[PDB]
Design a protein around this ligand. Sequence first.
Ligand SMILES: CC(C)N(C[C@H]1O[C@@H](n2cnc3c(N)ncnc32)[C@H](O)[C@@H]1O)[C@H]1C[C@@H](CCc2nc3cc(C(C)(C)C)ccc3[nH]2)C1
Length: 320
Amino acid sequence: KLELRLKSPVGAEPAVYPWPLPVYDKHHDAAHEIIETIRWVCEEIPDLKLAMENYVLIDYDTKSFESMQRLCDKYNRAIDSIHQLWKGTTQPMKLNTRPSTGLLRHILQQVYNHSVTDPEKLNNYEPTSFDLVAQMIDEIKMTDDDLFVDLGSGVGQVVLQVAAATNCKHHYGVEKADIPAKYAETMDREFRKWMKWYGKKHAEYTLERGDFLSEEWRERIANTSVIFVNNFAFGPEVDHQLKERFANMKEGGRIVSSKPFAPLNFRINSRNLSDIGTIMRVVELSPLKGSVGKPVSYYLHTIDRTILENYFSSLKNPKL
Ligand SMILES: CC(C)N(C[C@H]1O[C@@H](n2cnc3c(N)ncnc32)[C@H](O)[C@@H]1O)[C@H]1C[C@@H](CCc2nc3cc(C(C)(C)C)ccc3[nH]2)C1
């Protein structure tokens, strides 16, 4: 049918690619997706690499189908070879694995390229976040008991990313507007599709329609251990409304944001006991060197009512 097919490394349904090979944006074509996909699978399987590298030269002219099929076939043949070896005394790769950071960037990238049909329909109302978000996840030091929500989910790329790098129960995304929430519906599928295509595990997640300020979410925000929220352009109305939901939150949970929900040099005194800063720490996170008003940093808030307790331990016994 004048097309290309890649064979899944765990005998899942192959990836179909129509010719000519679609270009998605100024820096992303499906041609390189392929090349990437291949060398990423070569990564999981040292054997496939062994069967490929010692023969392949990696590079081909992407303009020619006669040259792209040349590679795909080579790859597809190497796959069968390994699958045969999978019938021998040797074990296959462990199926219950999470993606390595490197791999996952590529995966989410595919999910974007394939689901975002019109890369302009949202980018008009919106203004690599991956590397950034990755940093935050190491900073969050997430434990198997936490719950995560992205407030204002968008198409939920982060929702997905957290779901693959951490290890917890149903993680959630909340999106009000129909457009990005609609894209999220197919973003759900492709992600789950490609994950199976690669044979990698991901925590349960759910990309939802709704407003986070609404009555129902008041409750849920309080139950959620980890909160990512990009609040750069939020405006005082909504900013205050969040602080109240964050108030109810359990002890020790975290909030990551572009803008601080509590001042940085916050000392507790007379006319500030009502303020949210009383129940949380706010340490500043330094930005990754390759990501973009140039001067920007980030803020990690941790629920700490010992901050408060100390002030009420101090009103008893003035040492000065
Ligand atoms: C500016 C943020 C909040 N957001 C805008 C979206 O918020 C949505 N939104 C507005 N108010 C809404 C409402 N009350 N309920 C439902 N959703 C609403 C709105 O529809 C819009 O699509 C965009 C971020 C993008 C989602 C992916 C994402 N990038 C993140 C970056 C970060 C950093 C800054 C800490 C690194 C953290 C989390 C991220 N998630 C969508």
